[PDB]
Each structure stands twice: as structure tokens, then as C-alpha cells.
Amino acid sequence: TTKAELVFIPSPGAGHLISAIEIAKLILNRDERLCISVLIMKLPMDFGVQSYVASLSSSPRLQFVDITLDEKTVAGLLKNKESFFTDFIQGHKPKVKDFIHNTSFSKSGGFSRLAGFVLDMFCTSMIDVASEFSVPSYIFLTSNAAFLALCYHFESLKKEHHIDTSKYKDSDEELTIPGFKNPYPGKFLPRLTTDQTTATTLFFDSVTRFKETKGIMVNTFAELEPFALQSLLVPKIYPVGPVVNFKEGGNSESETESIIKWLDDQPESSVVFLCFGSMGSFDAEQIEEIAVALECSGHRFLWSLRRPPPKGKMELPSNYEDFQEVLPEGFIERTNGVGKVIGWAPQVAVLSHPAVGGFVSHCGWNSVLESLCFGVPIGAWPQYAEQQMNAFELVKQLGLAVEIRMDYFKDFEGHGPVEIVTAKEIASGIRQLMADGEENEIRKRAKEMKEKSSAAMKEGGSSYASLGLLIEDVISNIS
Template sequence: MAHALLVASPGLGHLIPILELGNRLSSVLNIRVTVLAVTTGSSSLTETEAIRAVAARGTCEVTELPPVDTDHSVEPNATVFTKIVEKMRAAKPVVQDAIKSMTQKPTVMIVDFLGTGMMSIADDAGMAKYVYVASNSWFLALMMYLPVLDKVVEGEYIDIKEPMKIPGCRSIGPDDLIETMLDRSNRHYRECVRCGEEIPMSDGILVNTWEELEGKTLPALREDGELSRVMKVPVYAIGPIVRSNELTKRPNSIFEWLDKQQERSVLYVCLGSGGTLSLKQTTELACGLELSGQSFLWVLRRPTSYLGESSTDDDLVSAGLPEGFLDRTRGMGLVVTEWAPQVEILSHGSIGGFLSHCGWSSVLESLTKGVPIVAWPLYAEQWMNATLLTEEIGVAVRTSELPSKGVIGREEVASLVRKIMAGEGEEGRKIRAKAEEVRVSSERVWTQGGSSYYSLLEWAKQCRLLS
């Protein structure tokens, strides 16, 4: 049996996509898959839980590698991006030892874009090497073209008023820049450029999107032109790859409440595990939800400006809400302060919209369920994702300015929510219809003969996992 090795970078946002990719490779190609997980070490409990959940399926062999010490090579105030890249670099000997101990040597190695420094291990072991980009092809195009921009652009990107052109793709406006491009003097920018330089050294790229979703950008990565000459290697669109509904235990309070709501009547509000807001923005968002008159399920994080130690205690978290908000919205809304199973929530028939930070995993979880989005991007590449969803795919509405740059008022929140939930105006109706169209498309691409199914088989043949 053919054997594929996947190496996951630290952090749930990188670990889960690699685990789900491993599950897809095993189930579709019927090959042996081993996942080596480089963990953070300091907060590995949730990582361990994710690993156990995938391992329980029996489709992949998952090994949690011992954490590596990078305190001597990374400044204490370094960005998360820099810390992850450095941990991957430091983990090379551990990964090499793990490969040497395997009775059946893998024929192919897959890393995510933060682990491109691992590819020399594949060269030494005689393995084919591929990069998995668990985001969209527009983000991939920017990553690949960033080394070119680094040479030709003077000064800070954020100071450039005109959109920067990427050959064959949508241009990058000042509000679309990924977080690592905001300060070129920071080490994380140099690491980002290095990733862009190393990706073409692979044998190919797997990207978590599909042909019908990004039919304008994917051709630019492949057809003869300036961008494809930068790429140098084939690109395989194999998405959507998302988490499946496999929870053995559900929070009864959430689903008992959802079961009582009308079909497509509830707005799901969740800004990701790191999506905390200021106290003022929390207040405006709460008042906007109330003003909208729409039902909502809100997974609430503690406001960033709330005084006191970080806590998941309900009283401490809800202290950031306007006085009387919970009483006034009782029955209309449900505020949840503990972990909530997002995929199962989005799968529930009562969910009709998603106010999201636009992390790509959350985006795909929403699109594959036909749920339109209120885009609320906060950091990383989420600003790009929000633009893609609103201006190219047409499944979302977004705020008038970036939430990271100012407070979004309650009236605007209410208007956006009603547009998505009630389908107010022609725009709202088109968005809801487009979301359903994308859902159907996301299912079709994984049927036999579908574009992603075919792309995965072509990749497997290219790296000799299939005869």
C-alpha cells in the first residue's frame, strides 16, 4: 500500500486542516497516511483533543511529536507567524528521527506553507514533496508573487494608495493586505517572503478551493504567463476539505434551543477562537443584534478591554454586554460562553446566516452548508477572504470599514444582519441564492468525475501513490 506523510504545523488553525487532508487522502485514495504533528507545547490540550478525534476514525496514523524549545531563537514579542515558522525549523531533527523509525517509508511528504523549511527532509529521504495551502487560490497567488513585490515595491505596502497588481488575478488593495505585509521591518515579513520563495521548490501545490469557486484565479496560476512562471509547479484544487460532523457529545442547551427555532431563522455569530472585540465594539454588536430583530446564537469571547484575569466564567464574559441585554433578548437570542461545535451548528436547519471573522476554514464550513456570511475580518488573511466573498463569489456582505480600524455601529450591524437573514433588497436575495448555488457546487466537485475528485486522482498519479 502506498504511504503518504503529512507534517502539521503548530496551532489548531494549521493542525486541523492537515488532519482533515489526511482523512480525505486515506478515504478517497485508500492509501496509508501518517500525520506527524508539531505542537505548541504550551497549550497543547486542544491540539491533543483534535489529534485524538481524528485518530479515533482509524483513517490516519497520528503521532504528536514532542515540543521543541525555540525560546533562544525567537524574541518573546515575536508574532505567532514567526513563532510557528521557527518551531517548524527547529523540529526538523525530530521529524527526521520519526521517519527513520517507520517500517514502511513514505513515498510523498506534504507540509503546509509554514513548513516549507521541512522539504529538505523529503529530498534527503528520496520522497516527493508537496505544499498544502489550506486557504484560497487568491491567497496562494499573493504568497507566490510576494517575492517579486518585495523587489519592486519601495516603502511600506500599507502606504500605497493604488491596488497592487498580481498578474491574471484580482489586485490587492490596501484593505486586503495580509497581516504579515503591514510592517516590512518585522521578522515575520521576511519569513513570509521566504515561504513564497520556497513553495516553488516543491513538486506541486494542493490548495483548499475548487475550480467552480475560483474560476478566475486558478487559471492564472497555471496558464503560461508571468504568475505561472513564478509558480513553476502544478497546482491542484482539491477543496473543499472541511471538518465532518462526528461529535459524540453535543452541548444539549445549544441544540435544544436551535431545535425550537424556525428554519433558516437564526444568525450564528462566532469570530473564531482568537476573535475577541473591544468592550465598545462588543456593546455595539450586541445592540445591533437586538436592533435587527433577528434570532441569533452568539459564541461570545471576553472583551479585550474587560478588566480582570482571562476566564471562561459566564458572568465574567457576559459582563461586557449592555445592561439588560440578556433579559431583553431572552427567547430571541442565545449567548454561549463555552466551546461550541461550529460544524454541527452550521449544519442545523435553523441557521440562516453566519457573522464570521472569515478564517478560511470557517468560510468553507459555512459555504458547504449554503449559509451566507456577514464578513467581519479581524487579522491574518481574513481581509482578503472578506473581499473575495463579497466582490467575487457574492455570498457575503461586509462592514463599511475594517473592524480592526474602527468601531462598527449598531445601525450598520442591524442593516447587515437583516440583509442576510431577511433577504432585504435585491442584493440580499442574490446573496442567499448564490450561497445555495455554492453549496450544490461544493458537493458536486467530490462526486466521481467532479473537478476536485479528478484533481486529487491526478495528483496521486503524479506522485505515484496510484498506479
């Protein structure tokens, strides 16, 4: 009884790999007639993927294959410090076709014909390898539907109408974008839409190749982004989210216990939770401005404070040993019993706790889906990538977040018009986020999304049937 194998090729890096495995197990646990091969690409300096890959146990219907090139080849692929990433992924094209002939599930025997490619956004170069075997490719976007509508619009502005999108940079003119109810102010656009860099022209070349695929799985659900989703036509969109990994309870549990044990002592829906994603940090004078707003607000707070990278290079934000380096004098011993300052945080464990009632966030989409899965309203303080669009959508389109400052951009090169958001903006945003008990109407819809996000994944839900339709078309390639 033959099955169908899907060749998952996520963009390199843990996070993309973890999201690819999450959606892979959703397909395997839904339909017995499918196996999946995840192809891992590893960068040289990526501790974490190396740490995470070693923990991978190959399920009987799920094989994790590592296909990276020898270091001789990879080293010769740093030639362009802004075309590295597209060059690196393309560099694995010959080792992908080798996997198809040797290590894949094909040649039979549980064993079955190859059936499709599910590629990440940065892996559109793999569409051509899938066509050498006369087999359709797919896209799995861990971003949302509104960002796909934004990519289609700016791909059209750049390649079809040949518009120089630099004009919209920090502008006050409002754009009409398919999938956005109200005009989009230019100053809220992600930098990838206005920056004329090398990386963005190669990124929008990948958006042009979205049209060659059979389908696109987006990490959202129909009731969350209804206007953005119904503006997308080619190709067929499958909202299968919210896809999210709760299982990795690890930051291991001993420090989470103290954080959880402390939140257990706080009143319910009373603590506003500070966190800014994997690479989010702040400069000395901005952390200063946050401590004043937190004290001046009067609410309980769990603040995740990480230490910045050296700015030369040097990987991700770290952790402090003591926050005597960072914090204003007396703030620590004055927020005794009301506030706590940590480094890396068990985000899902914190957001699921009943004491947390507000989530100030950079609006990274995985973080947003985690907050909405537990009904926690958001304070929007975006930093990088598409987060400025996530913020504008959550604040102005979905009524699910209060603005801290939507036109904020964290500059890694050492680009923005605003350096410091003030404690007066932070406290006023926090004051509005936790206000009015549970008659806060932004909090009211956050409650609703928790029920709708849970309903979308169970049988009968929009994401459940949409995922069921994705599998049917995948097996329709094999018949």
C-alpha cells in the same frame, strides 16, 4: 504488492493537525495503495494538541508519530520572540530524518517505499530533508487559491521588484493583483502584506520555496475560485476541497443540545449567527455597539460571545460565567424569545440547522467553507491573518457576502485605522444579509455553492478528479 507512504508534516497546533488528518483520510479512503505518517510537533504551552493527540487511534494504514525535541532544546528556541516559530519547526529537522530511518513505513514487510512529503505552509524548511532522500515535497494550503495568488504577487513585489510594501498600508490606491477581477484597494490588504516585520519576511521566504515543490493542494474547489485558480501556473494546483471536519461533534453535546433544541423552535432561515473564530473577541465598547444593532435590526440571532484574553499573553479567548458583566442593561431580558447569547459554539451544528439564515463571520477560511457547505450567506467582519482578503473576495469578487466592515483589523500587540464599527454599519449589513426572503441574490449563490461544494467532492466532481490526479502523481514517484 508495494504501496506509497506520504510523510505529512503539518505546522504545529491543533487545526493544522486536524486539517492534515482530514485530507489524509480522504486519500486513504480513495486509494488502497497508500499509507500516511503524520509527524506532530508540539509547543510547550499547547493544551489542546496534547488533549487531541492523546485521542488519536493509529489506523492500520495511518500512523501518528510524535517527533518533538526534549524540553531542553525547545526552551533554548524562544531566543527570538518573532523568529520562534520558524526556529522551532527547523529544530525538528534532525528528528524528522531519524523518523525516516527508524519509525517510517520503509524497510518493507502493508509496508512500502517512501513516496513524498506533504508540508504545511510554515514547514518549507522540510523541503531540504525530503531532498536528502531524493523525494519531492508538496504543500497543503488550508487557505484558499486567492490567498496563494496574493502571496505570489507580494513575494514578487518584495524579492523580485524590491518594493517596500509599507506604502499600501491603509492606502486608497488600488492594486492590480493576478487572480483578482477588480483592482484591490490597499486598505483591504492583510497586515502580513504591508507589515515589514520579522515574521512576514520569513513568511514570504517560505512562499519563495513554494516553487520547489511538485504540487500544491489547496482547500477550495474549481467552481468557487475560478478566476484566482486559473491565474496560478507553477507548480500544479490541486483543488481538493472543501475539506472540512464535521465529525467532532464536540464543547461537548449537552450545551449544544440546548442550543439545537432552541434553534429547532425558530423559523427557518430566520436567525443570523454571530461567530468570530478561535481567537476572535471584542473590547467592552464594541460588544456594546453590537447589542444595539442586533436589537435594532429585528431579526433572531444566536450570538457567540467570548471573553477577551488579558492582553498581556494568556492563550485564547475564554468564556463568561454570566453575560451580566458584558451586556447592556435590559438587553438580555428584552431579546427574550428572539435572541440567545452563548460562548463557544458548535459552529457546524449551528450552521447546518435550517433556522440559521445568516452568518456574520471573521471570514476565516474554514468557517467560510462550513458556511458555504450549508448555503448560508455571510456578513463579512474580518479580524486578523488573511481574513481581510477573504472578506474582499467574498464581497467584491464572489458575490457571496455583505460587508460589515472589510477594513477592520484586530490588534493584538495593542494596528488599524478604525477602532469601532458602528451599530449603524452592523444593523445595515445584517438588514441587507437577511433581506428579501430568498430573492436576496447573495443568498441565491450561497444556495448554489452548497450544491456545487457537495458535487465537487462526490465522484465526477472537480475536487474528486483533482484529488485523483494528486494520488496518481504521488504513485508516479514510487514507480
